[PDB]
Structures are given as C-alpha cells and as structure tokens.
Ligand binder design. Structure first.
Ligand SMILES: [Cl-]
Length: 242
C-alpha cells in the first residue's frame, strides 16, 4: 500500500535540498514516497490551509461565491499582488493571507475547530490566534494526511456541500493542457522551524488521477520554485506527465 522509492531522493539531493514527495495512484490504490518517515512527519500547513479555509467559508456563507470581491483594506503589504481587490480564485492563486485571515475571523474558533474535526484534517488543533493559527499556531499536517484530505475533496466526500467542494476545486486549478490538469495549492511556512515549502494537489489524466503532497526544507525564499520543479521531475520520471 505504501512503497518507498529512494531513487527520488536524487531529485532533492541534486538541489542541495531535503524533503519528501508522496504520490497516490487512485486507480491502483497504491502510494509511493522517497521517505516514509518524513511522509508521516507533521508540519504547519501554512497556505495549504487555504483549501479547508475556503471550503468552510463557502459552506457557512462567509463567502457567497467565487466572484465575491474582497476589497483590499488599503494597508500596503510587501507582496504587491496582495495590495488589490481579490475574489476567491485570485486570493487562492496569489496566496493572499489577509483575505483568508478575515474568513477565519468570521468563521470563528468554534466552527473552525468543529469543521476541521469533521474533515479529519491533520491534528485538528487550532490552538493559537484564530486569524493565524495555520501560520504560527498548533495545527500540523503530514504529507500522507494531505493526501487523505485531498482524496475526500476530489470525490466530494468531505462533510460540506457538493457546491462548496466544486468551487474550491475550481479555485485550485493551477495548470491545464491537452495532457493533464493540475489542481493544487502551494504553501510556505516560515514562522516556526523548520521553514518548509509545500505543494499539494493532484494530476488529472484521461483515465486516472495521481494525488501528490510534497514538502521540502526552505531556508530562504530563493528556492520556492523547487516545490513545483521537483514534483514535476518526479511526475516526469514516473511517466505521469510528458
Ligand atoms: Cl475547473
């Protein structure tokens, strides 16, 4: 059910990096990873938490739909794409933390906690500030736990409406061409050591789906592009994408 393929470690070592890639073949119900231990080590989800956060905000009516505009609050932040109006789609695309902080405040601690338990999400622990616990609070999730959650989302099996799940999966759209569709979310955790980058999601093919979750040490922002690059090298190696 879970096979360790250390040959993938070469895709990390070659970049003077360390991390884990977990793949799940949905048709075969078989998983693969380069590092079983790290695949089950739990980290802050950081912006990958925007997947459950979006679902909860939609199902509770905090977000009415993917067109609702969340106006910039006028406070200049260091990430230029954050200093503008957003909807759910663009807030996901640019990982706009302040928009999702407001979602969390309107959701509130009690409902957030209850929904993360219903989702079986990570350690289900929201300890910390309601508007930042996924960045510097008590919540933790492993790569294998990301896969479990994403599989439920793909199959509309999470305990929210079908509509909420379809909208978030739309918002996760990252890449599409004649060969594959990637629905995914990046993450970048810097507030608690070790600093890591995340990429979690799945690859849709004509006749199969491959779920993936990767994290890697990210001592500086210079390596952020390796989250997608390393994953894609694994996907290419396994003949999942050309
Ligand atoms: Cl879509």
């Amino acid at each position: 059910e879970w096979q360790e393929n250390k040959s993938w470690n070469a895709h990390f070592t070659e970049h003077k990096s360390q991390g884990v890639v977990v793949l799940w073949n949905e048709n075969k119900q078989q998983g693969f990873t380069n590092n079983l231990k790290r695949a089950n080590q739990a980290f802050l989800p950081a912006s990958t938490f925007k997947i459950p956060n979006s679902l909860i905000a939609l199902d509770l009516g905090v977000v009415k739909d993917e067109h609702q505009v969340f106006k910039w609050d006028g406070q200049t932040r260091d990430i230029a794409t954050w200093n503008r109006d957003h909807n759910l789609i663009t807030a996901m695309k640019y990982s706009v933390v302040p928009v999702y902080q407001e979602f969390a405040r309107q959701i509130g601690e009690a409902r957030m906690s209850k929904m993360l338990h219903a989702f079986d999400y990570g350690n289900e622990d929201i300890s910390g500030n309601v508007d930042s616990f996924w960045l510097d609070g008590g919540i933790r999730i492993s790569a294998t736990e990301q896969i479990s959650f994403l599989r439920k989302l793909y199959h509309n099996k999470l305990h929210v409406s079908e509509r909420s799940q379809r909208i978030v999966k739309q918002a996760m759209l990252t890449e599409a061409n004649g060969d594959y569709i990637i629905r995914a979310k990046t993450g970048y955790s810097t507030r608690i050591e070790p600093k890591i980058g995340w990429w979690v999601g799945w690859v849709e093919l004509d006749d199969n789906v491959w779920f993936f979750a990767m994290n890697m040490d990210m001592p500086t922002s210079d390596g952020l592009g390796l989250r997608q690059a390393i994953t894609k090298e694994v996907l290419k190696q396994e003949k999942i994408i050309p």
